[PDB]
Symmetry: D2
């Protein structure tokens, strides 16, 4: 008898029920991981990346904190077999923006990495929801959908969940109210062509645009457009300051994971196919409000846009589609 | 009138009530910050460091995630006025040991950095608890205590809380039991010379040493002593693989912050001024199990140690004192 | 020496920092208590009531679950000295209406009861926020205000926070969307005479009244008016089925406590002094959206109401003032 | 089209972490609220025979949905509402009346469980059963016999609460949080439970080694009275408020957390103990068990003194003396 066999009588000689994989152990990947771990969303966490040392080191560092977590198994490996049986696979790997660089400048590189990553994910977790975080997220969500063969409910991009969170933060600062009570939606591209939906902004269901008709216009004496300009510029400013962004996106992704894993059916602005709305007929992916739960995106909310908002959203779709349409698979 | 005044009728025109400061926004400081944020331990978090762009970028990145948090105020700056009225001030800043640098010279460089940091902390939060996380932690805890002029109860080193968490992770992995139910205490000097207290190692109050009398000796067929060696060497391996450790330390610190901020009077093995115990006769800080609460360390547990355990604590104390006695304050 | 002194060396020989008191240990009082305990809002919980057996039993039962909580001190007694230094005191005690007793006489009995409770609360926690949960809440919040001598930011009635949560539950059931994503506000007097603000009802900032102009009217083929009718009748139905309500009130009250204790500045529809809105000239308390934080109600939202909505609030205000002016303090 | 169709464009048409609570008395509802506030389930079902009370409790919980993260709460007298539960927690049954023998009380619960348990098994054949009804060690056996489940899926709440109470009282005496005051109460829940003095420790320091009289009648400090108070505390609460609820609910939610999240923490729960401590009969008593996704996967074999071991054997004999008389 070993010490274990003297101490413990074994009765039972099972897959995880709530496994999540994070692909990519860069700063974004690891912020997603710690955020998911601290939210108790998974019974198993797997990490995958191509840099073996860094991957192992990250895994071990999380494991050493196990005592303080409620996720009893953390694994990693360059081989996708460690990701088998995931309910949710979060893809953060690939090139990221350098100072001053457009997320759209990342397309060729990250499409080529997705050509390797997505078939491997799909092979080991054929029923997962895919949550794409890598940039440009809207384009890569389309790509992941096309490569995976998944129905589109199961391919979700982090999209404008973060842009909307930034927007509500800044709104909150101007009004003196917690972001949880400042409502406003940013839709379209997670990037420079995003669309603030001024007509929907409210606190306690009081329309800000009804109170302030010039809201969001160039004529606005309070220059509320500058809030959206700051939303657009946020990642660039943070990158210039600390080299990359990580915490906000990690929190946003864990917010999405929470709705998925706990089947909440909360609404979030995430990247999905919008064909059929606003007279768009192209297979373009961008953010609109979607109901998120255990089957991914189960429904879209049809937002009532002003003609100016709709035009902006159409411009966003045209910019994204002009890229997506030329991709070769 | 402004949109704000049209929307909102002000009744009242702020002293922080549950504030935590983190000094140093390297990987350790930010892991402490995110862990504290995700455990809802503070109503205000202040970040301070000397590199202003990086500091602002970290702050902004955390603020952009505010929607997903319950800590409504996040501030930063090089000026310690941002830290005023902290209940708890966590010090992670300092110099890293260079190739060829003696331990004595490294500590002296950290003394010189502490002579700027500590009096600034003390000026703005004179009644805080100081929690030192910078390496080498036991010596820098002494440094902070001497410079601050604080009573012993309010100067705490992170010490062996992380070593014991690592130990319990490794134990759990061996026994197939969650670390929460695998008990064991690593005491003394953090890291290389720490002491595993084999007599206290247990599951459900069943003493493993009693069940397996070779436990923790060279001759043990199951080489349980390897578990402690792995705790010591775990860090080395993580450093060699990813460059540094961060996540486990962050979670360890947030565990300590939880007991302090919530006045839990849980017991943790943290570094405290131990002159008076164990035949220790110098002003050194070593980990023993301490009751932690709103006044810092209020009580400590007198662990019964074997002759060999006691000798190893004394050797550490002599070694620490041997460096401390050479420092220029 | 004793066992404790052999085990523990004492360093220091305590004011609670985040203490909450619940007055009244009926079902509502105890549901507030468990809800607060399970949200880790307090470092000390005090219970007070006049029925000494039941009070001690409730206290002990909660104490027996301390292992599973993070509120290290739970106390109780008939004497208000156990309430000292509370940040928040939650009042759930009050009269039951008698057959044939006028609403005026009933409120007068609560005045006389509050003339005992409130000055004893004020003696031991002069700087607390008072949260009145007792029915009829709007008038009892006025009574507490008048007896306490507190400024009006520190006297808060639970008001329509529950009514709005019910409304959102029912909305979410009809739409297949989590109530967190179904926005809508019920204002004015809690319960029978509450006002649903149809203009504010929305998902992702999309106004349902705009999409469906008959919303809230008797002309509506979908009878959305029945949602509010169910909000009003809900307590009646739950009372007929189980004898009383408790759980929802507890959870609602814990939501309010969270904003106050953590200084969140979230907006909640709670009872506050609304003299000067809506052509109301009297010292009456009714629910409007209020910003809640560490100083209680700091601000209120001026909701644009329809002529009918406004007239309903004014009518509640007139009825309340008709009673209040005949009370003897 | 309908408002709902004008607002929402539908793309898509089984709960994955579902819990059922059987019985909506004080204990059942305390379990329900504790489970809801710990976010352990994506669906909660409630079942009892008293339909008004059941519906009222369901609605009162539902009205709190905004504040919870359990998006579906259902109830009914028909066990079809409990389909596909991972964990079914049984709190229903008869309470012992004036003049009633233990045997007859148990039989009355056998007759109730003959309805409840097969209904549970029909709709959630792969669930774990957690028996909370009193006397728990015997009714766990009853549930096991009626269900036909393997031993690992039939768990009694057992001494998890006794142990929590003991650590509360130990903590009060020492001025340390219960989380840092370790000690295990085993065997039969309640009156005949056994405090294992040898495992009582703070930070791995054995109190018994420091204080050899610990747990003996000789003890100047009367530490035996801490265990007496564990037994008597319940009687006291019952005398004061009429019943106990909150602590049972928190204890049961602690067990459910380990099961639902596959934590493999160790808890002292009621499990079939035949083959230990000289016990040869099919009886359930509390020992420390590893709890996870498949129920009880492993038992910790605590080293007991002869006296402690005799007390469990006596309990086993008494339990078996009752069980052999029951009519299934
Ligand atoms: O994760 C850890 O456990 C960790 C990370 S760094 C770390 N260190 N660092 C020293 C250290 C640092 C500078 C010195 F001059 C020195 F002599 C030692 C000791 C540790 O135990 N330990
Ligand atoms: O859940 C609820 O919404 C609820 C439970 S009781 C409840 N009440 N209770 C009164 C009430 C209670 C005693 C009185 F003397 C009285 F004049 C009114 C009004 C409510 O709206 N409302
Ligand atoms: O909170 C508790 O700890 C508690 C509440 S009831 C409770 N009981 N109930 C019995 C019990 C019930 C019926 C019987 F026929 C019998 F012989 C014993 C034993 C407990 O230990 N214990
Ligand atoms: Zn919200
Ligand atoms: Zn523990
Ligand atoms: Zn180290
Ligand atoms: Zn009511
Ligand atoms: Zn009992």
């Amino acid at each position: 008898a070993t010490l274990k066999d003297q101490l413990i009588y074994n009765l039972l000689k099972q897959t995880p029920q709530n496994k999540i994989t994070v692909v990519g152990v860069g700063a974004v990947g690891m912020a997603c991981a710690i955020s998911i771990l601290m939210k108790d969303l998974a019974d198993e966490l797997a990490l995958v990346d191509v840099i073996e040392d860094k991957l192992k080191g990250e895994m071990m560092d999380l494991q050493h904190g196990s005592l303080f977590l409620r996720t009893p198994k953390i694994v990693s490996g360059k081989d996708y077999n460690v990701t088998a049986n995931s309910k949710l696979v979060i893809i953060t790997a690939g090139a990221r923006q350098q100072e001053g660089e457009s997320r759209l400048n990342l397309v060729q590189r990250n499409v080529n990495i997705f050509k390797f990553i997505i078939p491997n994910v799909v092979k080991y977790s054929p029923n997962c929801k895919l949550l794409i975080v890598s940039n440009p997220v809207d384009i890569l969500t389309y790509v992941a959908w096309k490569i995976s063969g998944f129905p589109k409910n199961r391919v979700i991009g982090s999209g404008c969940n973060l842009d909307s969170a930034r927007f509500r933060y800044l709104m909150g600062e101007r009004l003196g109210v917690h972001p949880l009570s400042c409502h406003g939606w940013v839709l379209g591209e997670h990037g420079d062509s995003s669309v603030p939906v001024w007509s929907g902004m409210n606190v306690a269901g009081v329309s800000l645009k009804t109170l302030h008709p010039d809201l969001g216009t160039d004529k606005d004496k309070e220059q509320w457009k500058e809030v959206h300009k700051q939303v657009v510029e946020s990642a660039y400013e943070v990158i210039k300051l600390k080299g990359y962004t990580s915490w906000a996106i990690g929190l946003s992704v864990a917010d999405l994971a929470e709705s998925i894993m706990k089947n909440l059916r909360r609404v979030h602005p995430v990247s999905t196919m919008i064909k059929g709305l606003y007279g768009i007929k192209d297979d373009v992916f961008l953010s609109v409000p979607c109901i998120l739960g255990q089957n991914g995106i189960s429904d879209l909310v049809k937002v009532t846009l002003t003609s100016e908002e709709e035009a902006r959203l159409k411009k966003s779709a045209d910019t994204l589609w002009g890229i997506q349409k030329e991709l070769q698979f």
